[PDB]
Design a protein around this ligand. Structure first.
Ligand SMILES: Nc1ncnc2c1ncn2[C@@H]1O[C@H](CSCC[C@H](N)C(=O)O)[C@@H](O)[C@H]1O
Lengths: 310, 42
């Protein structure tokens, strides 16, 4: 609830990211779209893929309870008898950093047009073999022209804040990051603690993107683009369909508040940027924005997309 | 397998997050980010 809009914004990011590359794939394929949702969680993206009209989805995760729960949502969606088409689906419990997915698929010859890895990649960089294995499961069975898309913390921003901090910790009322040590950052196994009041409290690993870029070349992948969350937003909101969606998903908080409602943050200067903004020649009100606290926590992330060469 | 790739990467990215890391140094020049603002939210 304190994090209500933080969630919606992140969901909007995935919607637009997924949306963009669904349109690209369909521009090339003109047939049944197959997608791998790697580290699917409890199925937060099930609805997104349903809206995207894909034909088959494969949901996989290390947490067996999550996967089945993901399966349960999907069953509930398909079992709600209406007119909407839904993808056929497949659910696999598996460590995608130590296990080969191709041996687990129903179809041994399975290929994908898109692998979607949202907020998962950095767990694989515990070691080289695990990182290579996840990259392999994500990219090797991609159809030529297919994509590897996802979201993961920006190590540049992480190290920036770490080294600027007085200690080995940094964060606020909403998130916390704790490195064991600064100055030393191994290519693999660079461990930090991550706590996001409302979503995670789970050790993560530093992902040096030039490294991920290099490792991905192993499976004939070229970089499509890599963007900070602000950059991706600044591009995507330039499209009114994306902007209307931003509102419908309530991905920003209305500002200023109604006399009868409340801002989400009680923190004293959490909305200074918004206040300063409407101190210029008049703004059309109300504003949509995010608390400074929430933005600090989510601006840490970047978006990436790789393409499978021909 | 691992024996070749890791030391290979260790050399390729030894400047990692240092003064010789041109990408990172460029990233440090970036102004602190302000949160998205949208007008006419209604
Ligand atoms: N090695 C691994 N293999 C498969 N899944 C993993 C994994 N390491 C972490 N995960 C999963 O990554 C997920 C991080 S949470 C993000 C959930 C989902 N991607 C979404 O955006 O809605 C967790 O569900 C976790 O079980």
């Amino acid at each position: 609830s304190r994090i209500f809009y933080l969630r919606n914004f992140n969901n909007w990011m995935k919607s637009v990211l997924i949306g963009e590359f669904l349109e690209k794939v369909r521009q090339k394929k003109k047939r049944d779209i197959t997608v791998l949702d790697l580290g699917c969680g409890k199925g937060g993206d099930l609805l997104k893929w349903k809206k995207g009209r894909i034909n088959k989805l494969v949901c996989t995760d290390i947490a067996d309870v999550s996967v089945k729960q993901c399966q349960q949502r999907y069953e509930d969606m398909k079992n709600r008898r209406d007119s909407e088409y839904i993808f056929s689906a497949e659910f696999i419990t598996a460590d995608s950093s130590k296990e080969l997915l191709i041996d687990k698929f129903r179809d041994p010859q399975m290929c994908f047009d898109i692998c979607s890895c949202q907020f998962v990649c950095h767990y694989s960089f515990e070691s080289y073999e695990q990182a290579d294995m996840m990259l392999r499961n994500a990219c090797e069975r991609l159809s030529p022209g297919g994509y590897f898309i996802g979201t993961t913390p920006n190590s540049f921003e992480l190290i920036r804040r770490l080294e600027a901090s007085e200690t080995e910790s940094f964060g606020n009322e909403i998130y916390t990051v704790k490195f064991q040590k600064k100055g030393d950052y191994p290519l693999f196994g660079c461990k930090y603690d991550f706590n996001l009041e409302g979503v995670v409290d789970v050790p993560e690993f530093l992902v040096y993107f030039p490294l991920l870029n290099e490792m991905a070349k192993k499976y004939n992948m070229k970089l499509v683009y890599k963007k900070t969350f602000l950059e991706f937003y600044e591009e995507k909101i330039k499209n009114n369909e994306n902007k209307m969606l931003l509102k419908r998903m309530q991905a920003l908080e209305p500002y200023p508040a109604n006399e009868s409602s409340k801002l989400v943050s009680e923190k004293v200067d959490d909305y200074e940027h918004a206040a300063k903004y409407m101190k210029n020649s008049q703004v059309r009100l109300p504003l949509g924005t995010l608390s400074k606290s929430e933005w600090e926590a989510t601006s840490i992330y970047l978006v990436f997309a790789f393409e499978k060469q021909q | 397998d691992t024996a070749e790739a890791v030391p290979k990467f260790e050399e390729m990215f030894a400047s990692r997050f240092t003064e010789n890391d041109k990408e990172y140094q460029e990233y440090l020049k970036r102004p602190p980010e302000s949160p998205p603002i949208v007008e006419e939210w209604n």
